[PDB]
Design a protein around this ligand. Structure first.
Ligand SMILES: Nc1ncnc2c1ncn2[C@@H]1O[C@H](COP(=O)(O)OP(=O)(O)OP(=O)(O)O)[C@@H](O)[C@H]1O
Ligand SMILES: [Zn+2]
Lengths: 94, 52, 101, 50, 278, 286, 209, 50
């Protein structure tokens, strides 16, 4: 749901969404590594966990539409800047 | 006196031993170019001689 | 009829047929197969046909007899020794044998 | 020159041994291993160099 | 008468069934029959080289099973077209593919069957893209030994067939034999789509894939420099008295071009971060 | 099950020539002929096949005919002349499938328990590889319908053989060998950026098909899941790749070193014989 | 079309490499090679081959049909077990030999010392022996000295069975000696021990058998 | 069932015997130095999965 990953996700997020204390997010993420849904590194030098790939959940229709937003954003940015790079490399073909 | 790449760090603990030994790219290239400049010097007498 | 493991009984008279290093190649095969099946039991009857002692370069086939015998003289010893290769020998008169053997 | 490398893709030849030539512009050749063969000369060679 | 310069059109599925048939039976000569269409005098096409059953005892005229002629050709009649045979194929894998005595033994049977009865000779172990190994003939008859041999009314097309004078053993068999022109003619229904298969199915396959790279750094640098010292030796020996010195060789080979393709293709691979990623 | 296929273009020309056999006559719908095949591993191979007459009237898409006697007699010929070969399925030249194709498939799965079809195009311009593989199996359904027997897109490729292009690359004559270093990379740039992201735009067109339509099998099984395999990279604005630019500098590092040292040695290549042969040809001209 | 001609050069050596040995060079683009089929061939060299590789003899590659020279090969074609390569020593200590100061010190001067101080031989001009022969009453450790010097060598060590060369194929022997001596010059100031050389060294022959 | 035994024996008719060779040594990752028992020396490659 969140924007990208934030690269580093805090004990207040895991513990507050999880309605649990600070000292259970460790067993939460290691137990999640026992489940195998994630492969995340346990970034707890700041108690702020780094993310990896996860098993997804059910695609809602607003998830379809916002997925079309950032997905079309990716599509026409890689395609548009693709055509720009080909336009710079256009004069060297012969 | 002796060495094992145990470089001193007063405030680390591991006293980190690390290196990247294979960098023979610039080694062999520099060793070639040093000889190459001697080869261009070996051409300089042919060049300056053939003209005038 | 007692151990019954790997009795390679060489009659040692039907080895040579006519050829050059054929009997040599048979010696290499016997020693390599003998190296393989680790409890091999080598037997050789009637060495005196192939054994001899030495000549003064007489009959030309006795050369090939001598090199075929020196197949045994090296490859029984070599630098790589044999393991569990029990060489059982039989003869009629052992006086005519080679002191190399 | 590079299109003229099928010349190098041509069939090779034999090394022979000339004992001596006989009459009517033929020679004798034993090859690497075989018997003797009364074989034919070419035009651009020399019978005087047999 | 008077005789026009002939021509053998192909469909190239002929050549594909010759490479696949002679590739399948590769330690053995095979014998077969060639289907096509008698278009006219100066041209004739092959449109079908089809499978013919094996002989085990002798590759001969008895390799043609007539119930396989009725059944095979009739099931070609209830395939899309009942076209006419144009000759016969075989192979010679064991040597340089000249006309065996079987071929002259069945040539009179094949020209009793057909007008032309053109041979098809091949060695299936020659090339991967290059050679045109197939060989084609016409046994002209010995009854025409009074008249001049191989009339070929213009002999301009035949004079331009006369470029290789190929196969000096067949040239030893120039008694009543001569090769024929075979073009590799176009198939606009097939050539462009073969170019689509070929070109588009090979240019990255899916044309999306590679657009390996960090070990060709070390492999390329060793391959380059290890040649570069022996490339740079000879300016010790560069001198004057031009004819009195003899060692001219280039020392720049595979150090311009392999390095341009190397560092440019892998630096565009370094650009695949920005090209692929945003 | 099937890993993938190995399909030579020879059997594709064995589709093409029978397309010439039907292009001259009244083509009702398309070609349906036999696909013979060499099945050894979970991978597949096809060296040969043959065709068979076929019509179909589009009123219940159930009146359609092959000749199994012809199929097994010519299969007896080809099995006789080649013991390697057996049937592996069928093919069709019209690039879009229809409802009867499961009756073709399951009607000829009685000979071998798999009968893979082949989509081709006699006039291809937009596809990549023509060849295509399905298998008619079931995942039942999530609701578990009465035998939703389903074609499954087994991956497919053009096969290869030593000395099969003896015709081909001599025929086409147009090949420019080893265009590495010149413009092949930007051919693949135009066709993968454009021809990849347009497929992405037809997949987002199918997403709009789920917006206004697409309730059939809205497919909340594989789409967001392998799209989460895509969503290994959530590349949103602010771009979040601070842990990738020293990575990018490490990637640029060695290559720009090779350009610096090595291309300086490329200058050292051109300069020597360029000067020497230059003034040889200059002041030795007269 | 130059690149097309390049691949037409490259296609000559893909599936076979039919091995012969280089025998004679007449001149440019013409040679004589003795193939390993026993017969000898008038051939031609290709411009790909660097002409210094010709030397006297080389393990060379040929063609099938044309039987043209294709390549000159690196030093190959084994010395049987190939210099034994790792650890295949009889494992005999140097002091394991009991009380032979004449023998151990003598052969120590003969082989072990020119392994080390050969440049100091070169300033005087002593001309140390190439090989050496050992003989006498059999059983006195003639194998054992080769075991100990083998155990205590640093360069290559090739044991050679003297009955080894008499084999089935007609003409393999002298090429095997080319293998031994090309490898001998190829490795190092090396050591080759040859045992039972009487199997080759017979003073009397019969030039009809 | 006799037609099944002659069916299997009929299927084995198209097979061809192969060559007994012995590896002298390995030249490169693709190049292999063998010598067959009947004579000369060769360098070839493996198939795919050898
Ligand atoms: N001086 C010694 N000190 C210790 N052991 C010795 C000594 N001399 C001989 N031996 C022993 O006797 C053996 C001598 O036999 P060795 O195999 O070395 O020579 P050889 O093979 O018998 O030569 P040949 O087949 O000509 O008789 C040594 O291997 C060792 O076991
Ligand atoms: Zn024939």
């Amino acid at each position: 749901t969140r924007p990208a990953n934030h690269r580093q996700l805090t004990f207040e997020e895991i513990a507050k969404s999880a309605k649990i204390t600070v000292n259970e997010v460790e067993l939460l993420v290691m137990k999640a590594l026992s489940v195998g849904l994630v492969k995340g590194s346990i970034d707890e030098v700041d108690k702020r966990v780094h993310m990896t790939w996860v098993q997804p959940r059910v695609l809602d229709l607003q998830q379809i539409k916002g997925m079309k937003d950032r997905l079309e954003f990716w599509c026409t940015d890689v395609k548009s800047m693709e055509m720009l790079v080909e336009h710079q490399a256009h004069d060297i073909l012969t | 006196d002796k060495k094992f790449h145990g470089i001193l760090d007063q405030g680390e603990g591991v006293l980190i031993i690390f290196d990247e030994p294979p960098v023979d790219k610039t080694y062999e290239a520099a060793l070639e170019t040093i000889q190459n400049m001697s080869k261009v010097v070996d051409s300089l007498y042919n060049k300056a001689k053939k003209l005038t | 009829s007692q151990l019954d493991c790997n009795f390679l009984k060489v009659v040692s008279s039907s080895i040579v047929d006519k050829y050059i290093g054929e009997s040599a190649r048979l010696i290499r095969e016997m020693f390599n197969y003998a190296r393989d099946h680790q409890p091999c039991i080598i037997f050789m009857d009637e060495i005196d046909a192939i054994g001899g002692r030495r000549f003064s370069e007489g009959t030309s086939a006795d050369r090939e007899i001598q090199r075929t015998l020196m197949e045994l003289l090296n490859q029984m010893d070599g630098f790589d020794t044999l393991h569990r290769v029990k060489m059982i020998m039989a003869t009629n008169r052992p006086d005519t044998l080679d002191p190399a053997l | 020159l590079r299109e003229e490398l099928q010349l190098l893709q041509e069939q090779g030849s034999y090394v022979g041994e000339v004992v001596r030539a006989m009459d009517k512009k033929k020679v004798l050749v034993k090859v690497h291993p075989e018997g003797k063969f009364v074989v034919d000369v070419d035009k651009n060679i020399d019978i005087n160099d047999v | 008468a008077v005789d026009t310069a002939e021509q053998v059109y192909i469909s190239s599925l002929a050549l594909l069934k010759m490479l696949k048939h002679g590739r399948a039976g590769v330690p053995m000569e095979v014998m077969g029959l060639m289907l096509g269409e008698f278009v006219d005098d100066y041209t004739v096409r092959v449109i079908d080289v089809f499978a013919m059953p094996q002989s085990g005892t002798g590759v001969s005229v008895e390799a043609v099973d007539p119930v396989f002629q009725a059944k095979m050709l009739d099931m070609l009649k209830q395939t899309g077209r009942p076209e006419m045979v144009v000759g016969w194929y075989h192979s010679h894998p064991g040597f340089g593919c000249w006309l065996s005595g079987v071929d002259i033994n069945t040539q009179q049977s094949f020209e009793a069957l057909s007008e032309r009865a053109v041979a098809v000779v091949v060695d299936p172990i020659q090339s991967v893209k290059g050679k045109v190994v197939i060989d084609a003939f016409r046994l002209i008859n010995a009854n025409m030994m009074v008249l001049g041999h191989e009339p070929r009314q213009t002999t301009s097309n035949l004079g331009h067939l006369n470029k290789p004078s190929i196969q000096a053993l067949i040239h030893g068999l120039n008694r009543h034999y001569y090769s024929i022109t075979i073009n590799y003619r176009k198939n606009e229904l097939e050539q462009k789509m073969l170019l689509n298969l070929h070109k588009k199915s090979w240019m990255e396959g899916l044309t999306l894939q590679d657009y390996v790279v960090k070990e060709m750094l070390e492999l390329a640098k060793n391959y380059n420099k290890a040649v570069e010292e022996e490339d740079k030796m000879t300016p010790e020996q560069l001198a004057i008295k031009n004819v009195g010195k003899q060692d001219p060789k280039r020392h720049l080979e595979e150090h311009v071009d392999v390095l341009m393709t190397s560092n440019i293709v892998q630096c565009l691979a370094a650009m695949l971060d920005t090209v692929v990623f945003k | 099950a099937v890993q993938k296929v190995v399909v030579h273009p020879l059997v594709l020309l064995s589709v093409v020539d029978h397309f010439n056999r039907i292009g001259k006559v009244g083509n009702q719908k398309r070609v349906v002929g036999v696909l013979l095949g060499s099945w050894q591993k979970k991978v597949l191979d096809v060296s040969n096949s043959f065709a068979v007459p076929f019509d179909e009237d589009d009123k219940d898409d159930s009146v359609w005919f092959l000749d199994h006697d012809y199929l097994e007699n010519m299969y007896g010929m080809f099995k006789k002349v080649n013991a390697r070969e057996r049937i592996v399925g069928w093919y069709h030249t019209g690039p879009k499938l229809h409802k009867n194709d499961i009756a073709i498939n399951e009607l000829m799965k009685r000979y071998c328990p798999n009968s893979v079809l082949v989509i081709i195009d006699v006039k291809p311009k937009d596809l990549g590889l023509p060849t295509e593989a399905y298998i008619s199996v079931e995942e039942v359904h999530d609701d578990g319908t009465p035998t939703s027997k389903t074609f499954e897109h087994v991956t497919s490729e053009i096969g290869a053989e030593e000395a099969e292009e003896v015709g081909v690359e001599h025929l086409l004559r147009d090949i420019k060998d080893t265009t590495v270093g010149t413009l092949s990379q930007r051919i693949t740039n135009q066709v993968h950026g454009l021809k990849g992201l347009n497929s992405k735009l037809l997949d987002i067109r199918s997403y709009l098909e789920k917006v206004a339509t697409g309730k059939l099998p809205i497919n909340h099984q594989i789409i967001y899941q392998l799209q989460d395999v895509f969503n290994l990279l959530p590349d949103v604005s602010l771009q979040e790749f601070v842990k990738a630019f020293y990575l990018k500098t490490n990637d640029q590092m060695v290559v720009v070193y090779l350009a610096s040292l090595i291309r300086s040695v490329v200058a050292l290549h051109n300069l020597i014989n360029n000067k020497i042969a230059n003034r040889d040809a200059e002041k030795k001209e007269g | 079309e130059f690149l097309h001609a390049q691949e037409e050069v490259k296609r000559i050596q893909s599936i076979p490499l039919v091995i012969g040995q280089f025998l004679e060079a007449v001149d440019q683009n013409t040679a004589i090679v003795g193939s390993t089929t026993g017969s000898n061939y008038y051939v031609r060299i290709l411009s790909t081959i660097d002409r210094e590789l010709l030397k006297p003899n080389a393990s060379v590659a040929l063609h099938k049909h044309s039987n043209a020279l294709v390549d000159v090969l690196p030093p190959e074609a084994d010395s049987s077990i190939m210099m034994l390569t790792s650890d295949q020593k009889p494992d005999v200590m140097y002091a394991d030999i009991g009380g032979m100061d004449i023998q151990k010190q003598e052969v120590r001067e003969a082989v072990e010392l020119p392994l080390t101080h050969f440049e100091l031989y070169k300033q005087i001009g002593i001309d140390p022996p190439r090989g050496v022969l050992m003989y006498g009453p059999p059983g006195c450790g003639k194998t054992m000295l080769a075991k100990a010097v083998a155990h205590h060598t640093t360069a290559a060590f090739i044991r050679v069975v003297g009955s080894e060369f008499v084999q089935k194929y007609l003409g393999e022997g002298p090429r095997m000696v080319r293998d031994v001596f090309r490898l001998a010059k190829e490795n190092a100031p090396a050591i080759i021990f040859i045992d039972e050389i009487d199997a080759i060294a017979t003073k009397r022959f019969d030039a009809q058998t | 069932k006799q037609y099944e035994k002659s069916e299997n024996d009929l299927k084995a008719l198209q097979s061809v015997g192969q060559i007994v060779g012995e590896v002298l040594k390995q030249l490169t990752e693709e190049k292999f130095i063998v010598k067959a028992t009947n004579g000369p020396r060769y360098v070839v490659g493996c198939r795919r999965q050898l």
